[PDB]
Structure formats: C-alpha cells, structure tokens
Amino acid sequence: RAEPPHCSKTPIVRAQTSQNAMSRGMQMQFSIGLHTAVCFRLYLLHTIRLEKLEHHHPITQRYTFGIPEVHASCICECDATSSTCTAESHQFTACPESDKSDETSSCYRTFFPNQTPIGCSEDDIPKLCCDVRFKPYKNMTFLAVKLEQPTTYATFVYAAYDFVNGYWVEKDKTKIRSQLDGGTQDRHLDQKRRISLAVTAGGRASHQLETGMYFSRTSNETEELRMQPLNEITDNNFDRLGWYRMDDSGHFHVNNGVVKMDDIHKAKVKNCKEQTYKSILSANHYMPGHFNLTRPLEVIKPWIQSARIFDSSLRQAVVTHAEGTNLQISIHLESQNLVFFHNASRIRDFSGSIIVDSKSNRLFNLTVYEASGKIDGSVKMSTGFGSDTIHTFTAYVSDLHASNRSMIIPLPAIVGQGARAICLRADSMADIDKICHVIEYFESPLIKGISSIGDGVMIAT
C-alpha cells in the first residue's frame, strides 16, 4: 500500500560550498514547513516530511496522586477524666489495624476536648474523638508533573519510493531527529550515505511552554495534560491537588496525615447524650461534593495540539505545537545532480475560528475537508466576501490522497476583533472553486456535614 506524500512546491536556492587547499561542491537550500513534504530525484524518488515538532518536558518532578472519599465517625465522652477518648488514643495517630477492613482505606484520628456539657452535667467538660477515613474515589489515578521546559527537537520522515509496474514502493524509511536550539545539525539520510540533510532554526519555536505543575489521568498510563491548582512535590496545601498520594505498592495516603489531620479536621459536639456532632474538612479536591476538574490543555489552549506524557517510562512529556514556523534545510552530496518535484492541491470545504488564546496567541484554528497539496487563504476586511484582503496565507497538506486535517494559522495584529470572511482556494484553481465563509472571532484573557454517630455509645455513664 506504499505511497509518497504530497510533494510541495518549494523555491530552491543553489549555494556553493566554501573550499580548502585541495579538490568544488554545491548545496541545495529550501525552507521546509511543519506538516509538509519535499521531493527530489538524484541524477528512486527521495522524500522528506517534517512530521513532528516537540519541546521537551523534563524538569523533574513526578508523583502519582488520587481523589479521596472522606468519612468521619466520632464518639463523645462526658467525663473529662475518662480512659475512653484520650490524647494518647486519638491525637496524632492512625486508627490501628481492623484485620478484615479494606487495604485501600487510610484512616487518621483527631482529639476534640474542652466541650460544652449538652445532654450532660453542668460541671463536667466533655471530649470528642474521631476517625477520619480516606479511600480512592472511582479508582481515579493521576500523575503530577513539573512540566515541559523546552528543548526543541524536529522529527523528520525520510522515505525513498520506486515506481515498479503500475505502483509505488517504499524502499527505505527512516526517522530523522534534529535539535533546533543550537547551530546547524547534519547527518546522512539514505542507506548509500550519498546525501546529507542539514537542519537550522531561525530562532525560538513558534510557541512556548509555561513553567509549573501539570497532571493527566492514568489508566493502570499517560493521557492529555490538564491544569488545576496542584502541589509541588515538597508542598502540602490542602486547597490544591495532590495531598492524597500513591506510594510504590499502590496504597493512597494523606501526605503527612498523622501530623496535619488536626489542622484540617474540625468537629464540635451537638449533644453528648444523643452522640451528635458537627463535622468538616478544611480542604478541597475531596469526595463527596468537593471535586471537579479542569479540561485538558489541548481543549483550552489553541496553540497546543497535544500535551501528553510520552510513554510508560514516565521520563518525558511531549508538547506538540498547533503549528510551528518553517525550518531551514540544505541538501548536499562528491558532485552530481538534484531536481525537485511537486504535486498539486485540492479542497472540498473548510471550517475554523479566529482565536486569541490565554497566552496571547493570535491564530486561525483551520480545519480542511477532503484536501491535499498547497492551499491558499485570503483573510478579508469585513464579513462580506469580496471585501479587502488584510492577510494572505498558504498551508500545505502532506497527504497524497485528499483527507481531513486540522491546523494552526498564525495571524498578524491587523486581523483584529469582530467576525470576518476568509477565502480558501487550492493551487491553480479557478476563482469559481474558491470557498468562502464568515469566520467567528473568539478571545481568551490572561458546607458543614452534621451527623449522629450511628455506631452508638459503648461508654454511656
């Protein structure tokens, strides 16, 4: 089923290599676009596609966490002297092993003395004792990451095709990786080692990464990165995510539960006789009724196509830029001949919206339908088709066969507020075939749960 990608139309600059006190070469220069292909023959058709643009993720931090289901059972002791409900039994301690009860559950004890004698004697000052219980909710698991900090890599796809009796044959197929932050990077591409690919970036890549705490769900296994107030590994804010953390075994616990439990659990006696009390947790991100989540970055951030932990090793996260600037290529060889070829373009329909994202990115979130090759856009003044052109663009769809693709089109500041018309036309298409639509403009800017014990009192009088 071997097939070449749409060979884009690219101007080629002939440069001459400098010389030493020896034996008069030449270099073929061109600017390749992200998600487009370049084709040439050596005088076996050679193709290079700038497939992926990635910023690296690591700096370190990593920790699995969950969402806890909290339940607190208490008991009152009317006589302040009593052996039942004491500082040694309740203050800073986990309720000792039940032997039958769930392994997933995690409990902590808190001591509430100096009570009011309600349903008691006027002189004796009561005391309250509680078991705060925590278990994972819906078995929800997430990795917390201190997230992508850019290093930039380009991923190219080199394929050499041959036309053997009516059909194309993918002879050689490699993945080329080149670091974009330094000077030119050079390597051979073909097995014959005759040709060399030289990649050079103009400056920093189109878009940028924020430094902070991120996370995504785990399926017992990385997913689309989300952003919601989350704790750095060394921090333990109860109003932010990750205070309910998973250790090695898969057991979830409250981060420094023992010690902190008394600062976050607050209970007062309602009536010591009936064994009634007012209870709450001074925290967030717990069940019941204290947990929702932020949508993936992909969804909220137009400049982001995808942001995911790369694999099972959980060492790097890959941020795929919605679109990126072109890269500078030079193809060099001894002394022979190079000819560059190009295919043509087609387009059924399109859809999209003009967006200024939270990180101040002005782009056209374009989606093409049954399209291939070089596609030319024209952003118009007003909603009226035929109004004055304010920007002109060209997108390159790499699929040989007309397919549906989604892309990011950087726009100048002239493409200001309000809805407007945009007209797309493929290459060499008559102005009758030109699709127009009015496109929309969007812009992003920059409690007490009272319960009666239930378990009954074992110590009445």
Author numbering: 12 to 34, 38 to 57, 79 to 255, 258 to 370, 375 to 487, 524 to 538
Article sentences:
Specific membrane proteins, called fusogens, are required to modulate lipid-bilayers and thereby facilitate membrane merging. The founding members of this cell–cell fusion family (FF) are the epithelial fusion failure 1 (EFF-1) and the anchor-cell fusion failure 1 (AFF-1) proteins, both of which are named after their respective knockout phenotypes. Both proteins have been shown to be sufficient to fuse cells in vivo, and induce fusion of insect and mammalian cells in cell culture when expressed ectopically. FF-mediated fusion appears to be bilateral and homotypic, that is, dependent on the presence of FF proteins on both fusing membranes.
Our 3D reconstruction reveals that the natively membrane-anchored ectodomain of EFF-1 has an asymmetric elongated shape. The ectodomain of EFF-1 observed in the crystal structure is in the post-fusion trimeric conformation, whereas the native membrane EFF-1 structure determined in this study is monomeric. A protomer from the EFF-1 crystal structure was first fitted as one rigid body into the determined EFF-1 EM reconstruction and gave an overall good fit with a cross correlation coefficient of 0.497. In this conformation, the distance between Glu 245 on domain II and Lys 400 on domain III is substantially shorter than in the EFF-1 crystal structure (reduced from ~12 to ~4 Å), suggesting a possible electrostatic connection.
